[PDB]
Amino acid sequence: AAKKDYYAILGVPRNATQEEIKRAYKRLARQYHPDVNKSPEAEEKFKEINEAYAVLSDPEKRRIYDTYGTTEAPPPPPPGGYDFSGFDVEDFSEFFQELF
C-alpha cells in the first residue's frame, strides 16, 4: 500500500538519469545475480532491485511512479495496460501491483 522507495533500493537520487539508474542496477546485479551469488539473502535483495529497476528504467513507468502520492490528478491507465517484458512481475510487491 505505502509508496516504496525504488531510488533508495538502487542508491540513486530521485533526479537520477536513466543512464545512472542503469549503471546503479548493473553494479548491484553484478553482486546479487543468481549464478554469481547463490545465497538466499542475494535472492531476496535482487528481487527488490529488479522491481525497482522494472519501474525506474522505463521513463514512462517512472513518471507514473513519481506522480504517485502527489496532489496532481493521476492519468487514467493506458489502453492494453503496461508492459514489463523481461521482469518477474507476478511475484512483485503489492505496492507494484496496485500502482500498475
Author numbering: 2 to 101
Quoted from the paper:
DnaJ protects the cell from adverse conditions through the prevention of protein aggregation or by assisting the refolding of unfolded proteins and is an essential partner of the chaperone DnaK in bacterial DnaK–DnaJ–GrpE chaperone systems. DnaJ, the bacterial homologue of Hsp40, stimulates ATP hydrolysis by DnaK (Hsp70) and thus mediates capture of substrate protein, but is also known to possess chaperone activity of its own. T. thermophilus DnaJ is a typical type II DnaJ, i.e. it lacks the zinc-finger domains found in type I DnaJs such as that of E. coli. Crystal structures of the complete molecular cochaperone DnaJ from Thermus thermophilus comprising the J, GF and C-terminal domains and of the J and GF domains alone showed an ordered GF domain interacting with the J domain.
